[PDB]
């Protein structure tokens with residue numbers, strides 16, 4: 069059943085419930101992309117940057133993924149749809165209302181079984197990932213939360229022993245608005261090997277970009 073439609077997020081979800089095929093992840097993604105292109109802008113990674121996220125996953129084939137910043141569940145659906153049987157996505161969202169919409173988005177898209185949604189701040193949840201969430205290390209991290217948190221969380225992930233030789237970090241919005249402290253760290257450190265992907269801001273013609281940084285080991 070539908071939500072009131074009071075917030076943009078409830079309206080994006082209602083649109084999906086009314087205008088997309090249940091259990092069809094592609095259909096769900098197209099509906100969110102269409103709604104935000106035509107009706108109301110929203111901070112989903114979008115279809116053009118979404119294709120870059122697709123290719124990174126398809127190249128490195130992660131089994132254990134971490135996403136920081138869920139929102140309405142667009143990238144969770146996008147990433148989870150490409151995962152092998154037994155692969156897990158952990159997605160961390162601070163806002164309980166978004167987390168509610170994300171769970172519903174994920175259920176509807178048929179990727180429920182792939183996703184562990186955790187309500188809370190990344191800095192409180194990250195130190196718990198091993199003991200509470202049964203994580204050894206991560207194959208891949210998607211960073212798409214507050215941009216001033218990209219660097220402290222990257223270091224925290226390192227300090228907590230969650231990064232290994234070959235962990236792929238992928239960061240949205242390194243051009244728009246930017247995360248220059250994170251970008252200097254990964255590019256400047258011999259612990260990371262970086263690739264830059266120029267693209268466009270979601271639903272706009274503004275230039276944006278993603279950075280891929282593969283961890284070398286400490």
Ligand SMILES: C[S@@+](CC[C@H](N)C(=O)[O-])C[C@H]1O[C@@H](n2cnc3c(N)ncnc32)[C@H](O)[C@@H]1O
Pocket residue numbers: 111112113114136137138139140141142143144160161162163166188189190191212213214217
């Ligand atoms: C750009 S949106 C996420 C978009 C999502 N990755 C997508 O493409 O569909 C940013 C989200 O990050 C969340 N967020 C910001 N800081 C956070 C933190 N420290 N821990 C967990 N979530 C956070 C915000 O509440 C917001 O929902």
Ligand SMILES: O=c1c(O)cn(-c2cccc(-c3ccccc3)c2)cc1B(O)O
Pocket residue numbers: 109111112113137212213214215240241244245269270272274
């Ligand atoms: O994930 C995000 C993202 O993908 C884009 N922006 C963002 C920042 C500044 C301007 C604009 C912007 C410009 C022009 C038109 C519309 C939006 C967008 C913010 C977040 B975030 O998590 O805080």
Ligand SMILES: [Mg+2]
Pocket residue numbers: 111112113212240241
């Ligand atoms: Mg973004």
